[PDB]
Amino acid sequence: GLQKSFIMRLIPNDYPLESYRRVSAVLHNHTGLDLSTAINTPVYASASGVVGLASKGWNGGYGNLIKVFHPFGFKTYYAHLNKIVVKTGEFVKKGQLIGYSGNTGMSTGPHLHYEVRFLDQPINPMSFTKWNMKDFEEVFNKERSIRWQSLITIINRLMQ
Amino acid sequence: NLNLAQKHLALMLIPNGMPIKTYSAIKPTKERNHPIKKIKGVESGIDFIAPLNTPVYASADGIVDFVKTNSNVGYGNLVRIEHAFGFSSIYTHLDHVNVQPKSFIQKGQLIGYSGKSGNSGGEKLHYEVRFLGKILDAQKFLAWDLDHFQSALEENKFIEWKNLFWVLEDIVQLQEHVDKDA
Ligand SMILES: [Zn+2]
């Protein structure tokens, strides 16, 4: 109900590039997700939060790197960017423009590198990218290592 | 001026209020020997002078990222909670810890009991509120509530509060029964 949309503002979901949503309505790393795309494709936050780090640099081969910190231990990483349009400490919405895709850092060809983390631990991004309003059980089905019981109950009591 | 839903949501997700209910005084930690650095004058949150085994409560929703128990040096027994939007709270010198690392936390949930463990200088709760690891004025967060909503908005050197409430407005919007039909 109201539950669904609320949860999807705070917990990362969907593709962070538009043309991968339009299609979905893409190869795995070890670990994260690489999405090949031309330079300067817009990159959107998959949930609301704070920009934990907008780092213009080599960042171990990530190139230009944005870390978004989400509620309840979730983080998203957006790497190989051409430009970053947010600063460290800035608050962003779900769907907000944060950067433009590129080929910076250690990259064989232009693409977005996307990770979802829970407490600095990588988790399968495909479980969150294919999570959406229609396919709503999917992240609970496919990602059992998260204690969704505790989390959903807490998120509900916000709504009140 | 903000709506009530923004205010309420903010007070669930960002540290506010009193994490200990019984105390006889509140004192900046700057005025005693710092628990780690062992000297005065370090900008480091606050101390509640309080009796041993007073319950300590989480000042906002979050997740526990770090716990020390069975410690008698420095901060002593402690809990650190990671909150939404880059904030964290720390609770130190505890006699007992009730929560485990990686557990989700609700505002007002019991997390421990105050003590005198570590370089405490006596029975007290030591308390810090941080934003992306940077030390803030905790007293502004203590005094913050629905009827006195300005108090924390005064700590604005590192924090863009208008930006935060615009993001919060995008969340509370959804309680209206809508939208997005092409
Ligand atoms: Zn890559």
Author numbering:
A (entry chain A): 129 to 153, 165 to 299
B (entry chain B): 123 to 304
Source paper text:
H. pylori Csd1 and Csd2 belong to the M23B metallopeptidase family and may act as the d,d-endopeptidase to cleave the 4→3 cross-links. The overall structures of Csd1125–312 and Csd2121–308 monomers are similar to each other, consisting of a helical domain and a LytM domain. The helical domains of both Csd1 and Csd2 play a key role in the formation of homodimers or heterodimers. The Csd1 LytM domain contains a catalytic site with a Zn2+ ion, which is coordinated by three conserved ligands and two water molecules, whereas Csd2 has a degenerate LytM domain with incomplete metal ligands and no metal ion is bound.
Only the Csd1125–312-Csd2121–308 complex was crystallized in the monoclinic P21 space group. We have solved the structure of this complex using two different sets of data collected from two different crystals at 2.27 and 2.35 Å resolutions, respectively (Csd1-Csd2 dimer I and Csd1-Csd2 dimer II in Table 1). In both heterodimer models, two copies of the heterodimer (AB dimer and CD dimer) are present in the asymmetric unit, with each heterodimer consisting of Csd1125–312 (chain A or C) and Csd2121–308 (chain B or D) in a 1:1 molar ratio. The four Csd1125–312 monomers in two heterodimer models I and II show three different modes of metal-coordination in the LytM domain: the canonical metal-coordination (for both chains C in heterodimer models I and II) and two other non-canonical modes of metal-coordination (i.e., non-canonical coordination A for chain A of heterodimer model I and non-canonical coordination B for chain A of heterodimer model II). The Zn2+ ion is penta-coordinated in slightly distorted trigonal bipyramidal geometry with the expected three ligands (His169 and Asp173 of the HxxxD motif and His252 of the HxH motif) and two water molecules. In both non-canonical coordination A and B, one of the three metal ligands (His169 of the HxxxD motif) does not participate in the Zn2+-coordination and an additional α-helix (α1a) is formed in the linker between α-helix α1 of the helical domain and β-strand β1 of the LytM domain, making Loop 1 shorter than in the canonical coordination. In the non-canonical coordination A, the Zn2+ ion has a high B-factor of 82.4 Å2, possibly due to partial occupancy. Interestingly, during refinement of the heterodimer model I, we observed an extra electron density that extends from the C-terminal residue Glu298 of Csd2121–308 (chain B’) from an adjacent asymmetric unit of the crystal and runs along the groove between Loops 1 and 3 of active site of Csd1125–312 (chain C with the canonical Zn2+-coordination). We modeled this electron density as the C-terminal tail sequence HVDKDA of Csd2121–308, encompassing residues 299–304.
